Homo-oligomer: A and B are copies of this chain.
């Protein structure tokens, strides 16, 4: 076994002292392993599973069973060697030397006879035909496997196995797949409890069950790039290392696990703990902080989302469905961005789609995709692709009233069944998404008093009272009552206020100041300048959106030339004062030390 020792590791004597692992809850797969191994022919098991799943745990459990336990005939005292293809290429200046030692080791097995082999992730000795320079030593074992002289067990991943191993007929014929899936939360709890003994033996730690539960929950929630039964081990080992490095027996709690996860990635503690009810209450000010002034809108949205987050509804419909009725330049997009930022921590967690160009018939195809064999099949629909990229996001529908009704049908199954099927055949889930439909229906009379012809002065307070009823009736008459029944809430955006414009301009000015402080520049605005920018930068058919260009045209353009001229030196504060009256008012800059 010298060649085996050079390019592999034996398992039977290692498990004879049993210094590998205590197997937890993997009896059925191991029994199936013996079942497949006992076959006269086709006795080449392969375990398909993700890297997080403990497929090697099954193999070492088999080794432990062979060492001690119930083992049927033709399987007792079978020496099991794991082979690493990354080591077999040792000293391979040219390709032939690889196969020479390959034949030497295989004749070593044939002389040995009582050998069971375990392979690595596979599809590197047989799937090497798609690479340049890699060793394609595939048919090396085919005659010996066909003659039944050698028995081996492999392991792969399901998708890659289907995309390589299902191609060649000989490989798929002489290999029996065995499915290993991700263990659930309780199973990981018993696994952690079983490994806690060895972890406390190695790391001088005292581990509590609540700490293990918190570790598993945090690993499942805040980590998704890895699979379940490894990240808990990583967290507990890192916590043990961090406590031992700090070190007249110490203990670990859930606080240490949360701190470890935060240090790995994420904000320190806080959100990693359980504060949901208090998390919702502090949300109210946060929304009223991001958008300056909605009162009823934010209140209704908050009440709806607090209601829906208290778990009562089954996971068959999305978290929330809202219809934002209001004119442009009010802040519906800003409110949606703020809600997404609070709920998921990312600004880009919003998916914005405009329905003004979805009016005709066939355009709706690009919202789903195309049938196979036609243009635009490689890329799916915008909605389906963007949703399947980010399962936790907020869907936004701009100008819904202009969209063609057919998509509403799919919207129906979005709002009732909570899932959709794309043209590629996959399934996209909308359970964790919140759907918002922005609309401007009924705001034309509110925004513009004159509609077409001879109008009187009228009033402006009745709409201020019954805007919600007006928009509800307008949506009921314009659209199908069933769809309005499916949707959950309606939120109406009233007109802006001058003081709100003052807060907006204050935010823009101090955003400028916090970055211009690098040169130690202070910016001061007079109240006259505030009102002048408010009047110039506001427009009823545009709202507060022209302000971003207005201040840039007014302040930044003059500031740039004033700085570049040299009249202003680092370490000064500029105060803005308006010179003139009415349209002749001009912003002027006064420098102070």
Interface residues in chain A, defined as those with a beta carbon under 8 Å from any beta carbon in chain B? 5-9, 31, 34-36, 38-42, 51, 72, 74, 84, 86-95, 97-99, 120-121, 126, 128-140, 142-143, 146-147, 168-172, 199, 202-203, 233-234, 237-238, 240-242, 244-245, 247, 274, 277, 280-281, 303, 306-307, 309-312, 314, 352, 354, 356-357, 361, 373, 375, 377-379, 405-406, 477, 481-482, 515-516, 518-519, 552, 556-557, 559-561, 563-566
Contacts and interface: CB of A to CB of B under 8 A. Distances in A.
Q: Which of A142, A406, A552 has the most CB of B within 10 A?
A: A142
A99 B138 CA distance: 17
Contacts of A560: 303, 306-307, 309-310, 312
Q: Which of A306, A352, A405 has the most CB of B within 10 A?
A: A306
A39 B238 contact: yes
6 contacts: A9-B143, A38-B244, A40-B202, A84-B170, A121-B168, A306-B560
A129 B124 CA distance: 12
A83 B9 CA distance: 25
B132 A241 contact: no
A93 B312 CA distance: 59
Nearest to A356: B477
Contact of A312 (B98, B277, B406, B556): B556
Contact of A90 (B136, B238, B277): B136
B38 A245 contact: yes
Given A90-B99, A93-B95, A306-B561, 19 more contacts: A5-B143, A6-B143, A31-B245, A38-B241, A51-B172, A72-B247, A84-B139, A91-B95, A91-B98, A93-B135, A95-B132, A121-B169, A130-B373, A306-B564, A307-B552, A307-B556, A307-B560, A354-B481, A357-B477
A378 B121 CA distance: 27
A233 B306 contact: no
A95 B95 contact: no
A41 B142 CA distance: 33
A142 B406 CA distance: 44
Contacts of A74: 244
A245 B35 contact: yes
B564 A242 contact: no
A250 B72 CA distance: 16
A477 B564 CA distance: 39
